[PDB]
Design a protein around this ligand. Structure first.
Ligand SMILES: N#C[C@H](O)c1ccccc1
Ligand SMILES: N#C[C@H](O)c1ccccc1
Lengths: 176, 176
């Protein structure tokens, strides 16, 4: 009959329905964690594993982002895979270093990606779940976090369509 | 150009499609965090807020579970709401005390619930997302965690149907 209080978190979860593809085609792009340059190509220039075994839990990827706007420099993200279940199409990662624009402002940014199949008997389709949390910090606000994260996720879903060779109309953000 | 390694996590995410209901109806049961006795009523005997304000971020619920078997005592869960966004039908909580069977064995059990509406042109329906993580510890394995958690989530989806007065066939586990 005792408990230990802890601090609250910031964050938000998003889900999209994607038609016209399959979960394992989506996963071939989205699940190749250390090669995120092959996914979010509107943002990421290059990417490679720098610690551990590629796409195995505990590994760290380092990726380079194009300048956020002209005149700016390239920035770098280090992120650690902290959970991976490839057969269940889901994983979890955290930013552990770098100066990547916006994202490096957050304290303990953790993200979850989980792909699910809608029932074949209902016409199929893929649900793409993507969430983040961050720890509240004096130098930021939850609204700022969401302003940083959501445009990136939106860009990434667009880039996904490009790499799957399906129209952008294939993706629909679900009402929460 | 440096980074610090962090520990990895155990866990799993699950998604169900629920037909014959609306996100508002589901939320009226699932979203009443401190009254989980009015949701998972086959497992939970009673539930009350014991710190903070009911269903506001930071609050702690105390709930009591029926005995696992005859002669066994009731067990107790303390869990803190660490994120709540009711407008977006999503929240996150962690066990912060108690001796609730199985769940109290995990180190830093954290759970996320999200509800999404499928497009009306598709026939509507709700996607129910539910995930957990726990920290690796000597006295458990990830498999043992999954064997604690998934049967409870399954029971909870069944109990949800009872309270919604809809048949269990309304619920389909995605990727079953
Ligand atoms: N780490 C991390 C972020 O989620 C991220 C940022 C840019 C492109 C892909 C992913
Ligand atoms: N806290 C917590 C667990 O997720 C839980 C355990 C039993 C019934 C409802 C919820």
């Amino acid at each position: 009959e005792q408990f230990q209080l802890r601090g609250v978190l910031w964050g938000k979860a998003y889900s999209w329905k994607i038609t016209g593809t399959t979960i394992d085609k989506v996963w071939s792009i989205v699940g190749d964690y250390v090669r995120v340059d092959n996914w979010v190509s509107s943002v990421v220039k290059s990417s490679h594993v720098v610690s551990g075994e590629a796409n195995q839990t505990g590994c760290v990827r380092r990726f380079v982002c194009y300048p956020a706007s002209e005149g700016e420099s390239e920035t770098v993200d280090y992120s650690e895979l902290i959970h991976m279940n490839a057969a269940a199409h889901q994983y979890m990662y955290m930013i552990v270093g770098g100066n990547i624009t916006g994202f490096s402002l957050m304290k303990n940014y953790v993200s979850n990606i989980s792909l699910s199949s809608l029932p074949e008997e209902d016409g199929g389709g893929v649900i793409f779940y993507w969430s983040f949390t961050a720890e509240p910090a004096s130098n930021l606000t939850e609204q700022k976090c969401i302003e940083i994260v959501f445009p990136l996720y939106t860009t990434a879903l667009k880039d996904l369509c490009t790499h799957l060779s399906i129209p952008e109309s294939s993706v629909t953000l679900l009402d929460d």
